[PDB]
Amino acid sequence: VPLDGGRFATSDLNDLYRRVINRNNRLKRLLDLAAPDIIVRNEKRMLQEAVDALLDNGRRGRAITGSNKRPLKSLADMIKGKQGRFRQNLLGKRVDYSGRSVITVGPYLRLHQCGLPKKMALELFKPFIYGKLELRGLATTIKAAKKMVEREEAVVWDILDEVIREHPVLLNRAPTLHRLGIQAFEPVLIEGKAIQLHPLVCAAYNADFDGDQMAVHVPLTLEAQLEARALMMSTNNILSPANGEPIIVPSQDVVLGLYYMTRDCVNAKGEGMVLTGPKEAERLYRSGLASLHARVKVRITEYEKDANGELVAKTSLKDTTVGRAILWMIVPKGLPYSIVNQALGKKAISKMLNTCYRILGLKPTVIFADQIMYTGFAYAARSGASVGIDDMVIPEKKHEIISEAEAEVAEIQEQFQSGLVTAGERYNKVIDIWAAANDRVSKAMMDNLQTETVINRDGQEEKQVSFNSIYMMADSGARGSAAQIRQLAGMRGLMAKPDGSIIETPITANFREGLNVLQYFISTHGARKGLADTALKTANSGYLTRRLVDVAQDLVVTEDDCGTHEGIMMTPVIEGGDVKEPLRDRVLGRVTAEDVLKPGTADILVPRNTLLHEQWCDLLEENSVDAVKVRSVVSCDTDFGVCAHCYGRDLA
Amino acid sequence: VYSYTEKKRIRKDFGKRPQVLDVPYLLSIQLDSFQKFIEQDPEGQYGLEAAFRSVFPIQSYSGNSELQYVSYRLGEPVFDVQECQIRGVTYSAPLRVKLRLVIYEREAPEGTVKDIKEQEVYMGEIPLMTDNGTFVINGTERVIVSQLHRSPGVFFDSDKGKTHSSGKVLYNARIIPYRGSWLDFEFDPKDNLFVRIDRRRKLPATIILRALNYTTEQILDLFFEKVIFEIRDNKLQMELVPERLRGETASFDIEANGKVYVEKGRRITARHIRQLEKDDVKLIEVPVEYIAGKVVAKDYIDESTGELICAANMELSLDLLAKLSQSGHKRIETLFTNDLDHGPYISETLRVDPTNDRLSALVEIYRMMRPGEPPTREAAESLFENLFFSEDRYDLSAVGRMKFNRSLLREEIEGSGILSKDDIIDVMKKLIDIRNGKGEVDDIDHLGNRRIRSVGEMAENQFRVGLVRVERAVKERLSLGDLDTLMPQDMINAKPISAAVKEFFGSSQLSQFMDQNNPLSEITHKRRISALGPGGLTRERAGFEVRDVHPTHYGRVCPIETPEGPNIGLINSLSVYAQTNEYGFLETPYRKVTDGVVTDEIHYLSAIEEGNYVIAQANSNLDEEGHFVEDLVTCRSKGESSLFSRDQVDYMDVSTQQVVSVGASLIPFLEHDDANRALMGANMQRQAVPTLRADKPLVGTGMERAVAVDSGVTAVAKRGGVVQYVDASRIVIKVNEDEMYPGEAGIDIYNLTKYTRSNQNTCINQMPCVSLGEPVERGDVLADGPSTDLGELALGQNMRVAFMPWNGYNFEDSILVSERVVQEDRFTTIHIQELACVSRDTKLGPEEITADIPNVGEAALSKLDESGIVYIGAEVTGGDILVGKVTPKVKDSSLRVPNGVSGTVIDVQVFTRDGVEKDKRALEIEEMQLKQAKKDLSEELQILEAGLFSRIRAVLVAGGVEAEKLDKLPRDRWLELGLTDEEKQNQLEQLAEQYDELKHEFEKKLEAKRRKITQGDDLAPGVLKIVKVYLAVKRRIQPGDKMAGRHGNKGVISKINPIEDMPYDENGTPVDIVLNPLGVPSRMNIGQILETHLGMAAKGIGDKINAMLKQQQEVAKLREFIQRAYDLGADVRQKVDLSTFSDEEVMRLAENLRKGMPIATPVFDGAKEAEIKELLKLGDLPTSGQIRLYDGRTGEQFERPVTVGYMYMLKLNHLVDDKMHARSTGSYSLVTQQPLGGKAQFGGQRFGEMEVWALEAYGAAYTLQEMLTVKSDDVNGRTKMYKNIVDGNHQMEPGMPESFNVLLKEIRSLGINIELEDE
DNA sequence: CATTAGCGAGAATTTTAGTCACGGC
RNA sequence: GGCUUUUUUG
DNA sequence: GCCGTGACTAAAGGCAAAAAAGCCTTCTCGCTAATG
Ligand SMILES: [Mg+2]
Ligand SMILES: [Zn+2]
C-alpha cells in the first residue's frame, strides 16, 4: 500500500518471501559452480531456518525481527490467534447499514416501538429512498434523486416517514451477554442526535443510562423483515430462556410509584365515604377533595374465567383504598381483585404480572404492562418522593450502646493483660461482641425507622407504617436492601483485611455522621478488592462462555420421539435441614419417563409420555409424591440430534 | 491579614484543626527531579557529571592514547516554548563539552605525555524543562510519568506450597541488581538447595559454592557446627553442652562422673538439661551404635599407606571406626546435624554434586549459560568473571548496596558495585535460617522494598547507554592509533546518543501524551505513578496482590484515586504531602510529640521507620498546649490501629489532607461517601471540559487557590507593583522601587495566548481579570486561565437541582434539563480542530497548491482567494474545499472539509522549506507577523527610551539648561544640546554612548527576529510545503450528552424541556435540573445531599446581599451583616474583621458576592450538621431544607415537600456528534473487501461474534445469512441487491463469502491441499 | 570559482496438559 | 490503510 | 525392566468502541545540488 510521499509501506510477508528467494537464488548460483562443501552446509542450514521462519516465526527459536524490534507476522500468525483470520474475519465481520449512538430514555413510547434520530434514519434508508422516489416520479435519474436527498427537500421527510412505517430494525448492545441482547423494534422519527429507547427493555439489556453506546442494524430482504417481525419483537420475548420468570419486570421508580399507591394511612382528608365505582374515585382524587390513600368502601366488578372459557361478572363491596381503585382501571377482565389488595411490592407485581400471562395470553398482558408504565410514572411524578438529610433518623440508643461496648472490651483486653487468655481467644471474643452489638443496633434502628406515631380518628396515638422516604425505597424493594439501610444510619460493621482477616476495631461511625480518617482508609481495602474482582471477572467469565459455545453448538432438535423409556429419577434436593428447592419446579416442563405410581398399589396417577405443567403438578402436590423418574436429553437414543419430547417444554 | 488579590472575594471556611505545614509546590516531585540533572555538581554524583565519570577516561589497548573529560555546559535554546510549539520543533539546548587527548610515548616510562589537545566538541541536543515542567517534541506537549519498580536488593519469597500437592512451604531467595543478570536460589520438594541464573534451568547450588575456590571442607565448616569424638579405651566420648540438647530423644542413659543424669529410652527433659548445666559436665561416653547416623565433617587418610581412608560427606560405620582407630585418628569430626534446628540440606546437595575440582564446575556453568559450545576453560572463567564480578557488565548501585547491607544486618551502608563471596555465603546462611524458622520473610508490597524512578534517572540511564555505545565505537577507532593526525572531534559520533535520547523522549512506554484540557487533569497527570514500563509488570502479568492496597500506603499514595478498568491499582497517584527521599523512597511529614506535647517540629519519615513508632490520627482532639485532652487516644503502630496512652504516642499527622490526592481533595464532603463513587467522581472530574465563562463553585475544598497557582496555566505576578496598561492580549506591569533592579529595571510585559489548540481539541484561552491602576504583589494572580476565576479553580457550573422523579424522564439515571440552561449558554463550549495539507514532490509533476481547480463550480472558489487559501472568518460548511492542491495527470487531490462537520475558519499557517519560493499568501502572513513583532518591540523601546530621555532631561536640568527649554525643545533634541558644563558633561556625553548601544542592539535583535521569520521552516524529507487550518465550533447541550456531578452520580441528558413545565416554588423561581433520588440509597453516597443543603445556605446569604444592593442601603448595616456571616461557626480557625476594610473594598466585596458566598470545606475536617442548620437559620429557608413545589403541568402543590438546592454540575468530554454516525455504503478494505472501522474512515459497526451466537440461538436464520454474505464481502452479489433495492424488489442472492476464499489461498500457501467438492 | 554532501538506485505470571528421560522394587 | 504504542467509555 | 516419577515444554488469558501519536532493513558512490 502506498502512503504519502515516495515511500511504500511494506508488509511482513513480502520481506520474508524476499529473504527466502534471495537465499534460494544465492544457493542455486553457488551450487552451479561446485563450491566447497563447507559453504553449502551453512547456506542450506540458513535456508532451512529462513523457510522455517517464513512458514512459522518464533516456533523453533530466535525469531526474525525488523526495524520495529518485533517478530514479523508469519503465515501461521495470520491464521491463528485472536488477530488471526478466523476469529476476526470469518465468525465476525463489520457490515454496512449500521450505526452507533447513545441511549436516552423515552416514557411516551409504546412497548413495540423505539426512537430514532433523523440523521440515522436518512443515512440508513438512503437506498430505500431512491427507489421510492423514482416510483413516485419525483426524480427520474438516480443522480437526481441523490442530489434531492442531500438537499433535505420537503418531500424527503414525508417519503421517509412513509417508507419506515413498519420497517423493523434490530438493536443490540456490545457486549451481548445473553440472547435478549438483540431485539427488534418499529422505529419512529424523533429530533436530536440520540436514540430513544423503551424503559423496560433496559432491564433486559442490563443497560443503564450511564452513557452506554447502542448499535443499530437494518434487515433488507422480505424474508428478513418477516423473520424479525415474527421472532425479534419485544412482544414475543417476555419469558427468558433461562427460566420462566418474566423478563419485563418493572424496576426503580415504577415500583416506587406503585408502592406509593397501595398503602393505607390511619387518617387523611376525605376518608370514610362510599363511592359508586372506581371511575368516581379518579374524580375525587383529581379534584383533591380526598387523599390518594384512605380506607373506604367502593363497589367494584370482577370477571372470572371459571366457566368453560367464559367470563362471568360479579359485584360487591370491599374495604380497600382509593389508590387501589384507581389502579383497578388498567387491570384486565380476568385477574381477580384480591391480587391488587396488598402493599404491592416489587415481588408481588411481577408475580401479579405473571398471573396475567397465565390467563389472558399475550396482547392483554403487554397492554397491561404498558398501562402499568403510564399510571406508575404519572403517580410517581405526582408522588414527589424525595430524600432529605433529616430522613436518616439516627437511633438514639446506638450511641450509648457503643459506650457499653467499650465496657466489655475494656475487660477483655485486661484478660490479655493478666495472661488468662490467648490472642485467638481474645480475638474471637471481641469479634463475637462486636457482631452482637452490630445486630442489636441494627434491630433497634429497624424498630425506630419502620414505624411512626400518628393520631387516629378519635384523638389517640396509633402505630402505622412510617412514611420516611428511605423506608419507601427499601421496604418496597424498588432499590437497595437492609444492608444499605444499616450502612446509612447504623454502624458500618466489621471490616475485612486484604488477606481475609477481620480488623478487631470495627467502624463504629455511620455515613450520616462523619468518619474519622483511619476507618475510611480501612474500608478502602474491600472496595478496591471488589472493583478489581469486577474488572477481572468479565475477562475470565466471557472466555468461559466461548468454551461452552463450541462444545454444544452441534445440538439441534431433529425428531419428535426417540422411543425409549430410560430416564433419571428426580427428587427434591435436601441437605439435612430445609429443602433447598422443592420437587415442584425441578420436574416442571418435562415428560414422564414412566407412569406415575400412586402410594396405593397399582394405581396410575399420570400416564406415561405426558407433558407436565401446573394442572398436573398440583396433583403431585395433592398426592405428595416423593420422586418421579422423568425423561432427559442424556438418555435419548437418536443420534446427531435431540429427541423433541426429551427436552420437554421450552422456556420461551 | 490578606494581600490585595484575595481581598476581592474572601471565601468562608469551616474547620477546627489549625494548619502547621501548608501545601508545598505541587510539582516539586517532577521539576526538582530534572533540576538535579543539568547543573555542574562538584561531587560528581548526579546527572551528566556522574554519567561522564563512569565512562571517562578511556585508554587504548596499546595504552599510548587516552581520552579524558574536562568540563561541560549547556548552550542557549534556539527558540522559546511558543515558537517551538508553533513551528513544530523540539525545544532543546545544545550540549557543549571539553575533551582531552593524551598521547604516551611507546619508548618512554608510563605516564610520559607526548602531546595534549583540548577542544570543545558538539554532543547533540537535549530537551529542557518548560517553566510548567513539560516537554516539547514536535509542536506537541508530552510529560513523563514516574515509574515505580522493585527496589534492587534481596528478597525472600514463599510460595505457600501452591505448586506442591502436600502444601509444604518453600522459601526462595532472589537478588536483583540495578543492571545486569539476575540470580535465584530455591528449595525443591525433596528439601535440597538449588541455584539458577537468568530464569534458566534449575542447578544444584554447591556448583557455584566451590566455583569460588572453595574446598568441600571449607563449605562444611562454614555451613555447620563441629562435633568432636575422642577414642578412649575401646570407647568413644563426646564433649556435650546443654545448649545442644534441643529436640533430642535419649536413646541411651546420659551419665557422667558415675551419676545418672538423663534416663534411657524416652525424650530429653528441660529439668535434665538444668541439672546437667548445674553439674557442668562436658565429656561423656557414647555408644558406637549412636554414631551409626553421623556424617564425618572432614577428611581422614592413613599416614603409612597414604590412601584416603574416608573423606568428608560420607556416613561412617563401625568398620570405618576400625580403620580410623588403627590409623591413630583419635579425634573424629562430625556435623551437628539437628534436623529440627540445623537441617543437613547442604550435605544432601554435596551428595549429588557432579564434580568437585571446580574446573568441570566452570565447564558446566559455561554449558549452562550457552548450550552447545566448546567447553573452553579460560572462556568459562572469563564468562563467570564478567557475569558476577564485572564493574561494568554488572552493578548494584548505591541504593542496592544499602538495601543489601540492611537486610543482612550489616552496619556500613557503603560498598562497591559488585558482589562478594561473603555476600553469597551470608545469603545462604540467612536462607537456611529462614528454612529453620529463624528470621522472617519480607513483603513485596511493602513500600520499603519499592522505589520511585523519576524522569531524571530515565534520562541518565538512556544517556549512559548511548555513551557506552559511542565509547565502544571510539575505542574501536582509537585501536587504529595515529600520530596525532586527527583533531579530537572526528572520532566521536553524536548520532547514536542523539537518536537514543530523542527516540526515548518521543516513543516510549512512559512518554505518554499529556492532556491539558483543564488544570486539574494536567496536575493529576503530572503527579501520576505507574508500575508499567521497562523493569515492571505488564497489563496482564499482574496478579491479585500488586493491585491490592497495602497498610503502608497511608500518606504516600491516594487509596481512592486511580483509573478503573483493565488496569486498576497500578496507576495510583501520589499523595499531597508526599516527597521523594535522596535514595528514592517515599516519605511523609510528621510532628514529634514529647511529654504529651505536640510541637511544630517536622520530620520526614520513610516507610520502614513507620513500623517502629506510634502514629496518631489527624482528627485527634487537642488542647491549646499540645496535650491530648484525654489519656486514651487512637493510634496505629504496624498495620493495626488500637488504643494507647497519651505517653506512648510519638508522632502525629500534620493535617487531615495528607491521605488523598489532589483529585480526591477537590471532592467536597468526601467523608460521607463510598470509596467506589468517590473514585468515580474524582476520575470524572479529571475529564471535565472548559466552560465558556468560569464560575466559582459554591462549595469547595480550600486548596483551589494552590492548585490554580501551581499549575502553569494562569499568568502570575512575578514582581509586585501597579498596573499601567491593560489589553485583552497584553499586560504591562510597572514594578515598584523596592523590587526594581539596580540597572535597567524598567517594567514587565505579559503576553496572553488567545484560542490556542489544546491536545484534545479543546479551547485554551487566557482571561485578564484585573483593572487599570490597582496594586499587585508578588505571587498574585493577574490573568484568569481556562476554567479559572480570580485565582480559583472553576470547572463546571452551579445549577438549581431538585431530587424528584418527574414523569420518568429521569427513569434510571438520566437528567432533565430546562431550556433556560441553554438560553444562557452556561454549558456551550468551544472546540478547535486541525486540517493539514501536505505538498510533496512526486512524479507526474510536483503537488501544486493554487486556486486553479478543474471541473469545479464557482461556488467552491467563492470562498477562496487568488492564492488558493480560504479567507479568515469565512463560515465554511461540511463537504467544502479549503486549499486547492493539484498534480498534473491534471489530478485534483485538494484538501476538502471532513464530512458532517461545520465550523468557522480562525487561523491559517503556511510552512515553506528553505530555498523554496514563498507564495503571495505566505508573504502576507509573514509581513503581518513581522509588523506585529516590530510593533511590540518598538513599544518596549518607546517605554525604555521614555525612561532614558526622562533621565536625560533631568541631567540637563542640573547641567545648566533650563527645564522649560527642555519641555519646549524636541524630545530627541535633548541629546544634541550644548554640553558646556563639564561637571555634568562627564555623564551627559556618556548618555549618548549608551543610547547608541541600546538602539544598535535593538536593531540587531529586530533583524534577528526578521531573519528567523523569513527562515525557511525545516520539513520532513521530500516535503515541499504544508498548510494548516484551524476550525472552531460552538457546542451546545443536546439530548445525549455525558453530564455528571462531583460524587460519581453520572448521567445523560434526557430531553430539553420548556422552562414553564419545570417545577417551581412559591416565589416562582424555576428549577433547571431534576435528578433522580432513587440512585442515592443504592449508591449510598449520601454526601451530595449535604452538598445541596449547604448550597442552599450559600445563597440564603446571597439573595440578602442582592436585596440591599438593589435597595442601595447604607454601608454600615451591610458591613455588619457580612461580618455576622463569617463569625458563624464553632471554634473556626478562619476569622476575618471587616473593620480594617475600607468602604470601597467592602462595596466591591459585596457586589462580587451577588452570586452567593462561597463556602470551603476541608476533606476530613468538614462541617457537621449543626452549623449547617444554624447558617440556614441565618437565611430565610426552612431548617429541614425541604420546601414545597408546584408543577407547571398541573399547578397544584405536591403532597410531600422535597429537597432543592444548587449543586456543582459538570459537562464531560463526550459529545453525541463525536459518536453519532452511520454508514450505508462507502469504501472497502482492499484485502478482505469488508467495510472499514472508525468514524474518521466513515466505516460501519462491527458485527460482534457474541451477538452472532446470540442471533443463532433464536430461530433466526435468514437474517444471519444476509448479514454474513450480502453486506459483508460478496462484491459480486451486493451490487445486484443495491440495484435490486432501486427496483423495489427486496430479493437476495446467496453468493459465496469472498473473505472465505482468501483463507483457502492462505492454506493453499502452505503444503496443505484443500479444495471444495462437487454438487 | 572552487569544494563537497548526497541519495537513487543498487546491493548484502498463572494455570493446565502433554511428553520424555531417569529410576525404583 | 496495515502495524505498533498509549489514553478513555461502558 | 516396566510403570512411577519428576522434569521440561506448548498454549491461552473479553467484549465492543473511541482519541491520539509514530513506522515500512542498512551501506555506498557519481553528477546534481548544497556549501564555502
Ligand atoms: Mg453502564
Ligand atoms: Zn428422545
From Swiss-Prot, chain A:
Which GO MF term does the entry hold, naming one? DNA-directed RNA polymerase activity
In this chain, Mg(2+) is annotated as bound at: D208, D210, D212
**Entry binding sites for Zn(2+) 2:** C562, C636, C643, C646
Kindly list the biological process annotations in GO that this record carries.
Answer: DNA-templated transcription
* Range covered out of full length: 253 to 904 of 1407
| Natural source organism | Escherichia coli O157:H7
The Swiss-Prot or TrEMBL record describes its family as follows: Belongs to the RNA polymerase beta' chain family.
Q: How does it assemble?
A: The RNAP catalytic core consists of 2 alpha, 1 beta, 1 beta' and 1 omega subunit. When a sigma factor is associated with the core the holoenzyme is formed, which can initiate transcription.
Q: What keywords does the record list, in alphabetical order? A: Acetylation, DNA-directed RNA polymerase, Magnesium, Metal-binding, Nucleotidyltransferase, Transcription, Transferase, Zinc
Protein name, entry field: DNA-directed RNA polymerase subunit beta'
> Which terms in the GO cellular component ontology are assigned?
DNA-directed RNA polymerase complex
What the protein does comes down to:
DNA-dependent RNA polymerase catalyzes the transcription of DNA into RNA using the four ribonucleoside triphosphates as substrates.
UniProtKB/Swiss-Prot annotation, chain B:
Effect on the protein upon substituting I568S:
Resistant to antibiotics salinamide A and B
Q: Which reaction is this enzyme known to catalyze? A: RNA(n) + a ribonucleoside 5'-triphosphate = RNA(n+1) + diphosphate
Q: Keyword Cell division, does the record have it?
A: no
Could you describe the post-translational modifications of this protein? Acetylated on several lysine residues in the presence of glucose.
Where are the N6-acetyllysine modifications?
K999, K1177
- Identify the PANTHER family for this entry: DNA-DIRECTED RNA POLYMERASE I SUBUNIT 2
| Purpose of the protein | DNA-dependent RNA polymerase (RNAP) catalyzes the transcription of DNA into RNA using the four ribonucleoside triphosphates as substrates.
Give the family from UniProt.
Belongs to the RNA polymerase beta chain family.
This chain belongs to the protein called: DNA-directed RNA polymerase subunit beta
Organism taxonomic ancestry: Bacteria, Pseudomonadati, Pseudomonadota, Gammaproteobacteria, Enterobacterales
